[model samples]
Target: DDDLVDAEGNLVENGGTYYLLPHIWAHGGGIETAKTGNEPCPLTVVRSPNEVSKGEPIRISSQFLSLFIPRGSLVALGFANPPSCAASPWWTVVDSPQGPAVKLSQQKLPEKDILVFKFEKVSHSNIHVYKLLYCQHDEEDVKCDQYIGIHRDRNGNRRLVVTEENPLELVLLKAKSETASSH
Candidate 1:
């Protein structure tokens, strides 16, 4: 309930520096696969504003984007075999500052059989949301998955909206199914 407050708080006009804090899961503790259930940590950010002010175009910096989604790094799987972080094609969709943002396409990971869909360039006057999703090969039978929310404050701090009940999961198939052998 309180999370909605930040999402609905006073609007910060355009051209202002805001911090996006990563909604960290497993706060202050080492991420253990046992805790998360071995699933990709989901993250999302949504735009919630009455209007997008002029002259203050909300633009996202490449550096900040890198922090949320690392371009070239393997995702932790909490297993002997972890998924490889390959450069997959991803798309960015920015709402018309007047409407809520939506995700169009998700990044594809054929090697690990995972896909991620996220949005960018959110502002106080607009509603923007980012999401990360991962799917293992049907053969892997790794049913664990996650859904998380990402937030950016007026200071541009980004974080994974943390909660007492962390919902992220992790998993690895004990045996690979032959059905997914082609991909």
Candidate 2:
């Protein structure tokens, strides 16, 4: 039976701990699990590649709520706030030969894009992870460093850093069925 609960069957906001499938690590995959907390990780999944189109707005959210637009590239736990008229929590997908990449911006579509992430999936699993990449001044050359990942700085604050390495695995849980009644 499909269940969304902890070890004791107590309802967990999003399902319990699970691995990030379709791993994004450069060397290999399946070495990390997605972080869990009161505010779950903000991730969007396109189960089937056919469902997404180039330059389309992708939705990010959890079973209970949607995510907030991050103020910066440094993503951290509890960094995302609720969506209001002053802010938005949306991102765009860019088609790429490596895989589908993402473009996050404060504007509905920013004229000058900052970060571009490539999506890679591990075989035999539905999980997926994003490989962070940046563009040099040349603009034509896009590069990804092994050290780029979600990490904490000297202050012990969690943030997405390009200079340091921290595995940021992500997975998209099945959306709760609308027909399912609230417990």
Candidate 3:
């Protein structure tokens, strides 16, 4: 019973891509990313993808990238900007004012198994309402004991961060329609 839903209460497929919009909107923005030296990408929420990488089209349910929930699939969060940077950037946790936060990693490890998120309905009554959870003890046993929240920075850059407080309520918006078999 691996289940996930979009903003319209639609089931998310195993490899479907989508946009994550937090309940508290980020001033006309979605999940965004920025960087310094191009080693690891720092996360933020800004107006658009002008300077930021492709903010939407985040490939979710990456069981094809690995496995699935209860089976230790390290992905359930999302990703974007590929073909050039489409190799599924690894999400890593670093120190933040809010707490340990998530960011993208340029390098893909052979034994990748951290910062793995599990998506589930935030409430039993609302199929459209959801949250992203991190399992500290790995995905096999699936211990969703952490909350992934939006951390507001000095420049009003909202980021997905690990929060002990309220986790960001989320609803996936199905991404743009695919054109052809070509990329």
Candidate 4:
């Protein structure tokens, strides 16, 4: 896809911001970000590092806490922040289960290659639906064949982790209009 439109059919530019809510089917709850025991903040998107060029999809990244998981013979999929242009343990789309997933890297590639996630349209009825994708390699190999779902963490905080049995679907409410937003 070229450029992404929010539910209002507006362009999803490089800095265009919005919030993410799971289109839950198997489970019931919105995606919230929290530490260990306290209540969480409503999770949302940030102005991403990916560039917005012609005929190219604008990729964006999410924000979260960066907690390290051990890398035994097997890895935990947690990644380090970008070498540059980073928030706090920002969320990055990465390789998990050898399929498609968004989270930390496990001895994985640099965030510049793996940190980007594209918001592709899934459906358009009365509302617009989207799926997060990280398939940047090529047609020969595309990792975003599956869905981006939410999973529980160590403390059971609902995280946008690796896609598990239930590949997640998401719907969003776009931001308000200011100067260039009204359509």
> Between which residue pairs do clashes occur in model 2?
21-127, 21-128, 22-121, 22-122, 22-127, 23-122
What is the per-residue lDDT of model 4 for residues 129-151, given as tens digits with 9 covering 90 to 100?
66654444433443554445555
- Model 3 weakest lDDT span, ten residues long: 45-54
**Models ranked on TM-score:** 3, 4, 2, 1
lDDT by residue (tens digit), candidate 1, 1-183 = 111111333332212223222222232211111111122432122322212211111222222223332322223211122123313222122224323222212244343432222222223334332233332224554332433333444544222332233322211112212332353
Question: Which sections of candidate 3 miss by over 4 Å?
Answer: 24-28, 36-54, 62-74, 82-87, 95-98, 110-115, 124-127, 138-142, 177-183
lDDT (Cα, 0-100) at 42 in candidate 2:
29
Better TM-score candidate (3, 4): 3
Q: Least lDDT summed over 10 consecutive residues: which range in candidate 1?
A: 28-37
Local error of candidate 2 at residue 22 (angstroms) = 12
lDDT by residue (1-183, candidate 3, tens digit) is 545656785666666677776543543445656543333334432223232222557767554642323323446444556323323544556565556767654455332354467765665644476667776744346576887876666655566678786677766777886443555
Residue 147 accuracy (lDDT) in model 4: 43
Q: Which model is ahead, 1 or 2, in terms of lDDT?
A: 2
Q: Give the lDDT ranking, best first.
A: 3, 4, 2, 1
Give the lowest summed-lDDT range of ten residues in model 2: 47-56
What is model 2's C-alpha RMSD?
A: 14.9
The number of the candidate with the highest TM-score is: 3
